[PDB]
């Protein structure tokens, strides 16, 4: 019920500012004890908080980022917004939000709750959207009873990509791997699902690839090979 | 950038006890009470202890923590595989104006856990890429333990390294863990060779699959 939702750019460029947004419902920033902070987390790193402000709009940060942090709140919109500035790609990282709650006559729950987090990409080169191509199941390729097919998704940027099949009604048996990050700079992922072979002659399978970075949704068929 | 000192890794035998150890000051830790965060692969951190030694729900009572002078402690008794996580304290420092500290973070490690040997599927390129004057093969190598392969591709029998590219292995649900290989080619390439195959080495073993154009 509690939620916390962070939203704001995939990429920026070195320089410039970044402005994160954290929406959140379930619960009241204007409620005694209540906090939200962000922390934000260098990808293989470890977390660094950033900032919080809590319910009397009192505000606290990082003593060694301080020069370059504004946080703010909107209780019309319940959202919690974070600028820094003077992006560089050290700065590349997820950033999450995280509340903090004081139940009385207990002990505060220090960021008892983290939203899942937004990626952000700080670099030079420019979005690209990804390609998507059917992995079709081979005659030799099944496994038995059951057979595996996917999606290629090539050469895109900045992650991430997200992957789903048959709009979400297909959830058992699916595996989409983490992205390669090529030399050239691109990532690229794929998706496999696995099915019964025997299916493969009467369902229809297609992939649902989003990639947000680049406002692109493609719903890729993949049709047994022939 | 401060930074409270954990361990970089702990590990221990299901069922032992295992403490992950942090280290800060009198201004932090020294003056203030430390929460420790559970983060499995791929999610954010959660909760796991706060204030007095205290648990929120859904956190099991063999996760304890301690805290003496500058330094604080977490203690997992009853070691189990779902344990595997990176785990890290905070704390508040009143310094400054008043930040927060994390710690660095520290990998958990059960040992002793049974080898899985990988399975590997392997997809030749798409009709639809070479229509596009491209050629990507994609070997996909999962459920493997511990989480280390090496994989080699070969045109025809042998050995090509030009064009290929690998992930780290990532840990999986089930802690055991999944990595992928591409070799990218030209459509001349791939038409010109009678096969081409995916290796996987795990633990002096190897599985290998095979496509053909012609297929």
Known sequence: ?226 | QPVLTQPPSASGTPGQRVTISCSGSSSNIGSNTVSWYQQVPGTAPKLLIYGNNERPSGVPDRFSGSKSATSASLAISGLQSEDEADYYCAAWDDSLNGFWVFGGGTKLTVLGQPKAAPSVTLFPPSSEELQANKATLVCLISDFYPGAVTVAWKADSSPVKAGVETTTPSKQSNNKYAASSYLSLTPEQWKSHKSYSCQVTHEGSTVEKTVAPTE
């Open chain 1, 1 to 226: 019920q509690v939620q916390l939702v962070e939203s704001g750019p995939a990429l920026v460029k070195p320089t410039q500012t970044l402005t994160l947004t954290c929406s959140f419902s379930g619960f009241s920033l204007s409620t005694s004890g209540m906090s939200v902070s962000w922390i934000r987390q260098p990808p293989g790193k470890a977390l660094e908080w950033l900032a919080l402000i809590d319910w009397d709009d009192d505000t606290y940060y990082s003593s060694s980022l301080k020069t370059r942090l504004t946080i703010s709140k909107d209780t019309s919109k319940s959202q919690v917004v974070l600028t820094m500035t003077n992006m560089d790609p050290v700065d590349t990282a997820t950033y999450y939000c995280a509340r903090t709650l004081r139940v009385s006559g207990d002990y505060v729950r220090d960021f008892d709750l983290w939203g899942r987090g937004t990626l952000v990409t700080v670099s030079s080169a420019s979005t690209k959207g990804p390609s998507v191509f059917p992995l079709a199941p081979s005659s030799k390729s099944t496994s038995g009873g059951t057979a595996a097919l996917g999606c290629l998704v090539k050469d895109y940027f900045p992650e991430p990509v997200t992957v789903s099949w048959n709009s979400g009604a297909l959830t058992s048996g699916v595996h989409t791997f983490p992205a390669v990050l090529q030399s050239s700079g691109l990532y690229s992922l794929s998706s496999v699902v696995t099915v019964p072979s025997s299916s493969l002659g009467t369902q229809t399978y297609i992939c649902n690839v989003n990639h947000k970075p680049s406002n692109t949704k493609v719903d890729k068929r993949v049709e047994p090979k022939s």
